Amino acid sequence: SGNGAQGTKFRISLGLPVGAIMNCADNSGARNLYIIAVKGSGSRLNRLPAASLGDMVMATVKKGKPELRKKVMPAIVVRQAKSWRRRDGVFLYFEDNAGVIANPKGEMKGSAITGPVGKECADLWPRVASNSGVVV
Template sequence: MNCCDNSGARNLYIISVKGFGARLNRLPAAGAGDMVMATVKKGKPELRKKVMPAVIVRQSKPWRRADGIYLYFEDNA
């Protein structure tokens, strides 16, 4: 997943989702606005291989808003 802030991280790997209940054999899913725990795969050397919180601000899978429109972005970030 791309990182869209100026922290120096460029690519993130999601390892868990905050507030997601557990169920056997179910993978945690996250969408836009969800907080996740991620590691930095590409970026500044002092940020790499560390677990840090992140918020998903863009998702490429379309989702439906309450007013009926479908919203999606070009990439995940």
């Protein structure tokens, strides 16, 4: 996350290390995102930088439009599929890993998001919360 954060995020269980491939939820013409970095991640020997829901990552478009491929761009994780605990203790998880493509400040490249998004990402990013249909 970092710059465009609107408040804090309680710790979500990390489920997306680098090298992971998630789906592209928005209509920016990309199909999948390939995670190469996690913003705000710490430094430990041999530990992969792992991303959770709501975190801003650096990703490349492995499959999609050639205007988007072969370059690094910021993305935002909106669906995790690794079970995490909320403070009301419900363990929840989606059925797929999914993110959207955004600018470094948080404004989305696309305009609409398919599928649900996590509210722990919606509250952190309002532009994701704007184009989100259903927020769970």
